[PDB]
Scaffold this active site. Structure first.
Site, PDB file in Angstrom:
ATOM      1  CG  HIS A  74       4.479  22.061  56.412  1.00 32.60           C
ATOM      2  ND1 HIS A  74       3.191  21.707  56.748  1.00 32.60           N
ATOM      3  CD2 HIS A  74       4.446  22.411  55.104  1.00 32.60           C
ATOM      4  CE1 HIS A  74       2.414  21.825  55.684  1.00 32.60           C
ATOM      5  NE2 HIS A  74       3.144  22.266  54.680  1.00 32.60           N
ATOM      6  CG  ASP A 115       3.146  16.304  51.546  1.00 32.55           C
ATOM      7  OD1 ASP A 115       3.195  17.311  50.807  1.00 32.55           O
ATOM      8  OD2 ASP A 115       2.590  16.310  52.660  1.00 32.55           O
TER       9      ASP A 115
HETATM   10  C1  LIG Z   1       0.721  17.664  55.389  1.00 31.46           C
HETATM   11  C2  LIG Z   1       0.423  18.801  54.422  1.00 31.46           C
HETATM   12  O1  LIG Z   1      -0.331  19.696  54.743  1.00 31.46           O
HETATM   13  N1  LIG Z   1       1.081  18.822  53.145  1.00 31.46           N
HETATM   14  C3  LIG Z   1       0.820  19.851  52.166  1.00 31.46           C
HETATM   15  C4  LIG Z   1       2.082  20.564  51.823  1.00 31.46           C
HETATM   16  N2  LIG Z   1       2.984  19.876  50.924  1.00 31.46           N
HETATM   17  C5  LIG Z   1       2.620  19.801  49.494  1.00 31.46           C
HETATM   18  C6  LIG Z   1       1.314  20.357  48.992  1.00 31.46           C
HETATM   19  O2  LIG Z   1       1.545  21.769  49.092  1.00 31.46           O
HETATM   20  C7  LIG Z   1       0.040  19.990  49.752  1.00 31.46           C
HETATM   21  O3  LIG Z   1      -0.882  19.269  48.929  1.00 31.46           O
HETATM   22  C8  LIG Z   1       0.172  19.131  50.980  1.00 31.46           C
HETATM   23  O4  LIG Z   1      -1.149  18.760  51.308  1.00 31.46           O
END
Ligand SMILES: CC(=O)N[C@H]1CNC[C@H](O)[C@@H](O)[C@@H]1O
Length: 339
Positions: free
Chosen positions: A181, A251
């Protein structure tokens, strides 16, 4: 109409004109919902009805994993355990853990379908190495064999309500230290070490795996590009070696790790060129709109088949029937007692 490659979000708890413009764009394929989109079940159901009224072929998803990742936690949504709790149960009683995993997936799916949602971005197949704080208790277990059978059991529960699934974060976010993130994580292991352990659940699940989200992680001995922008990971390994034919969703391109790909539009192009069927652009709908209008043209027919297959299957029970359903009630009782 047919779905486009972009999954974005809406501005609030009811649809605005700007949302309806974005929803009508040919490159829109989906909506992802977050906590801010939820006040209560009646409001949510009205929101999803209105989304589908603009774009009938749209996919609606949410991150419902349980534990620290569950957007809807009130007005009757069952608070689900962290997946790590299921691995702990397995270490005491394997068969009971599989039974509980299936119940979790059924509750999860049935409650979401009751509100008009197609799918959840679950299960996490990252292995619980303990190295990754961003994953942490979202991982089922350390052992890829255990991850596989618990996830399979969860996915079975999802399927009982007609819901698909999405394994993540391929080829594995569990070994790397950093949080994608906010930084760009690295994993300097060999291809073979990654394949033998972290990738194994993707391969072993077979048809029980419907889709994948790849990690924004650089696997420095395999490809200099993060996995979601890597034709090596997405085509050579996932489509090639593993023969996977389910949907690939990037992602979130808004995450810092994804700026390794360029402007949002450039990163989106790169993810789709690499082999993603859909890209997520979260929490900046106007920037998502620039992506929608700027995306370079590509062949999409193979992607569209996969995207349509992520739509929930068959009829869902509305809340007023679900709340009286013995299976639902049984699952609730098992989750309560077993954990
Ligand atoms: C690495 C990580 O936690 N990514 C999360 C955040 N990005 C997009 C979505 O909100 C979710 O499914 C992902 O799992």
């Amino acid at each position: 109409t047919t779905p486009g490659p972009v999954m974005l979000d809406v501005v609030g708890t009811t649809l605005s004109r700007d949302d309806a413009r974005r929803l009508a764009h040919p490159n829109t394929g989906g909506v992802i919902l977050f906590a801010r989109h939820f006040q209560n079940r009646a409001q949510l159901t009205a929101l999803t009805d209105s989304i589908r009224a603009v774009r009938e072929d749209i996919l609606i998803a949410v991150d419902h994993e349980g534990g620290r990742v569950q957007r809807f936690r009130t007005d009757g949504f069952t608070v689900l355990p962290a997946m790590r709790r299921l691995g702990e149960l397995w270490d005491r009683d394997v068969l009971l853990a599989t039974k509980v995993a299936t119940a979790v997936g059924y509750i999860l799916a049935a409650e979401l379908r009751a509100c008009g949602i197609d799918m959840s971005f679950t299960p996490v197949l990252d292995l619980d190495y303990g190295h990754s704080k961003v994953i942490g208790d979202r991982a089922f277990h350390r052992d890829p064999r255990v991850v596989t059978l618990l996830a399979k059991s969860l996915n079975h529960g999802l399927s009982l309500a007609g819901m698909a699934n999405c394994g993540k974060h391929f080829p594995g976010h569990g070994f790397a230290e950093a949080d994608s993130h906010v930084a760009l994580p690295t994993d300097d292991r060999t291809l073979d070490a990654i394949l033998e352990q972290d990738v194994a659940p993707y391969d072993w699940l077979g048809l029980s795996l419907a889709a994948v989200i790849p990690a924004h992680v650089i696997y420095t001995q395999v490809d200099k590009r993060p996995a979601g922008f890597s034709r090596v990971w997405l085509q050579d390994i996932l489509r090639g070696k593993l023969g996977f034919t389910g949907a690939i969703f990037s992602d979130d391109l808004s995450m810092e790790a994804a700026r390794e790909g360029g402007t949002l539009t450039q990163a989106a192009d790169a993810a789709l060129a690499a082999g993603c069927d859909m890209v997520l652009v979260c929490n900046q709908p106007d920037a998502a709109e620039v992506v929608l209008n700027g995306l370079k043209a590509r062949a999409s027919a193979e992607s569209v088949r996969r995207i349509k297959r992520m739509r929930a299957r068959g009829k869902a029970l509305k809340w007023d029937k679900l709340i009286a359903q013995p299976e639902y009630l049984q699952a609730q009782a098992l989750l309560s007692s077993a954990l």
